[model samples]
Target chain A: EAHTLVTPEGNVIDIQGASQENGANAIIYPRHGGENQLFFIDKQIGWIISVFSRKALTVKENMHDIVQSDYCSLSRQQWIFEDNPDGTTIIRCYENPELVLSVTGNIDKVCLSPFTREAHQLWRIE
Target chain B: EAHTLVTPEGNVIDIQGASQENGANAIIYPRHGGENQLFFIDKQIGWIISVFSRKALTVKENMHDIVQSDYCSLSRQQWIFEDNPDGTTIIRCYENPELVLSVTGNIDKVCLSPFTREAHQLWRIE
Candidate 1:
């Protein structure tokens, strides 16, 4: 399906989360295409991690300063986004799900790009 | 609402996407509390960029590797969280509110922690 998913901040996204187990991910993928990163929005409830691939669930943890890569989706990498007290958002990586004690930082770091605070894993979100 | 939000990796999160415009982001926030960080699952569309703070919406880009702080919630710090089918998550930061052409990175860097990839901002999510 065509993912014209929009958020309160007015961001749009495409569909097609690839089931790939490795290498150079694409930015402009086809509708419902091979790139497993593609997903649909579920409204205000939250963003749904796609069922497109097991890869999305394979996110690895940002251990003590390791370099993040396109092939790094290992279990610890996947997370659910949420709000933080200081007016920031958290990426809630596994480890603790019942308590809000689930670790968090900001919303910008939960992405796939450049140099960020290894401790503040929740810095950014797309 | 109590957020039972989870990802395919079996991660869990609580309610409260706090609407803070300040510091010391709390993890265990009260439901609908001053911690506007709390949020519910919207099922499958994508992550909702919380309306809690101008902060979650003020996601700043890692321009030449500057550190992201908890109190720096400018229009540059907010973003939309999403799932990367490669099994990783991509946090999309916005320069504008209308297009998904916004910048993105791994899911981990969107946090407020520390020691992340200096060039790889997308690292840990917790």
Candidate 2:
């Protein structure tokens, strides 16, 4: 689905500087409807690419950090979106669903972490 | 609503040892239909208490880690569930929605972190 992913706290996913430099950090910031915040999910390939950066959301090779990087055709950049009956979406990495995207506490930086299935990982598409 | 919280990889939220002791760590494990895996949400207060532990889910005093601890009648234990139009539920701390629960990368420990609204923090209730 095409939409802005928002946190319960109201922050939106954004590419740092709207840069497509291949290692731009994907962070959360107050939503401004910026192109950097727009994302497209390729359901077939399971890639969530930034509208402005054109880079796909990715986890570190070791699945440590979440970044917007060039799509290397690796499964690390691929993500599967699970839509629940209760109106919640869980996005899991295609390579290992155990490692999913999450935000560090008190920090807006997004990273790939093991799935805790907690609320911060939960999102709303608007 | 009542259900088991499962990750995209199929791990379920579990209270360590099924202990009723306060300050029990809330971790994820492979589902086995254990009572410790069951969770109930008090929609009115936003508290997610463990079926076995009865301890409410909480963030550390610094809001760094997520834990299941005794209910101190604090807002930190209070959670707000946001059901999105997209069928996803975002759980936020009643005191600060910006802080939400997430799993650390490669680790099974669940903690409260700033809202990145990523998938690791997103959970599926089944």
Candidate 3:
């Protein structure tokens, strides 16, 4: 089953335009039940593969932006989900567990940032 | 007995000017064995008091800058010391446990930052 990643304020992780193109940007927006909003976790090797694009959510170039790419063992393509005390989930890059999936001033863009136990860095996977 | 708050890289937290003036800024510098660099922890109330001026380290004005002030039980003045896996100590604000002492873009200035387990936020007390 696929899951939607939502922030404390209801923003959901989304694949822009549901684009099947490799390297498409991963974004955050309100939940609209779009297939691009759903992701599947492959725990065996740690992947948050997108349901719409059938690609892995990966960190690209300089460890900042996230993109959709074919799955591999690279840490940038892998992720670990940990729970926060506020009942939120923290998504961390397998490459560096200290860095977590974060939504910063970039608004729609999703990036990896230092884990700060901040609201923007937490999510609810459902 | 007084103690020096030192970073893993050897910089010690110092009270600027060693002045008796309230709200004197606290900065980190190479240890010079100055009394301004020595703090006496008042465990009963949790203050990192400067031995030179006998003042407490407290966060002021939007909780960003640290200054030397008279002792008080305010969360900004109270701290919790926790040991990290790297054998360094992390100082957290009692006002908000999730926030820790950090040295950020301002360079020498100390501020309360969301705990990220980053090297810049970890320290050694000796």
Candidate 4:
């Protein structure tokens, strides 16, 4: 029902319902720009995530990745940086709606997409 | 034409044109939560600002203030938060379109609303 899903990897992907004109769901690939990629876990077991940054959040890199390491192959590493209330940065990925990294820390063991909403994927730069 | 304006007091108000049903302009008061209050200083010297958050950006408060001290009197003190490229917090006010706090620093000498957007009233907290 709800179209927002957060993959185990922490990637927020929004799977909009099929519309009239295009009948195809819109999948806006994820990048880093403060865009609203609504990646939420549902009551059942489904997740919906928005993969694209809302045009406005795209500062200098329009639809480009701000981080350097994962710049080239963004398809698998599309992620969302959630600035926690305590000023912590959580690295979320948009791999599959079913799996994620972990609730607390980055789970490298999980062979899921490098880009997910798992806490294990989180890094502390500051 | 464009129904957006940043008041001199620094309050962002959306001057939505007269639409049919509610021909009245929709003036959404500003709060945080990443609302898109399109505030822009025109090349021709005109300012257009959006006072309402586009439904989604609203977090805890459906339309409530998040800041502590400024949370009480949210009227004229309304503002838009623009996160700069280098992560700077600029306190913007929504006074009147024609007038603002100034372009930089706190212009305390001015008798304008403490919430004015005259670059003078604007404060770079961090």
Q: Write the per-residue lDDT of candidate 3 for residues B2-43, one digit (tens) a residue.
A: 898887568889898888778898987888998999987745
**lDDT tens digits, residue span B1-126, model 2:** 357877768898888888877788888888898878998775644668787765678787887777787554468888877665656566788889887767778758777777887886677767
DockQ (Cα-based) for each candidate:
0.02, 0.01, 0.01, 0.01
Q: Between candidates 1 and 4, which one is better according to DockQ?
A: 1
Best prediction by lDDT: 3
Which rank order by lDDT, best down to worst?
Answer: 3, 2, 1, 4
User: lDDT, candidate 4, residue A27?
Assistant: 34
Give candidate 1's error at residue B11 in angstroms: 32
Which residue pairs show collisions in model 3? none
RMSD of every candidate to native, in Å, equals 21.3, 20.5, 19.1, 16.4
lDDT of 3 by residue, A22-93 (tens): 899898888899889998775644778787776789999689989998654467888887876777888999
Candidate 4 per-residue C-alpha lDDT over B7-35 given as tens digits, one digit per residue, 9 for 90 to 100:
34544433233122211233333433232
Candidate 2: segments with Cα more than 4 A from true spot: B1-126
Number of the top candidate by DockQ? 1
TM, every model: 0.22, 0.48, 0.49, 0.21
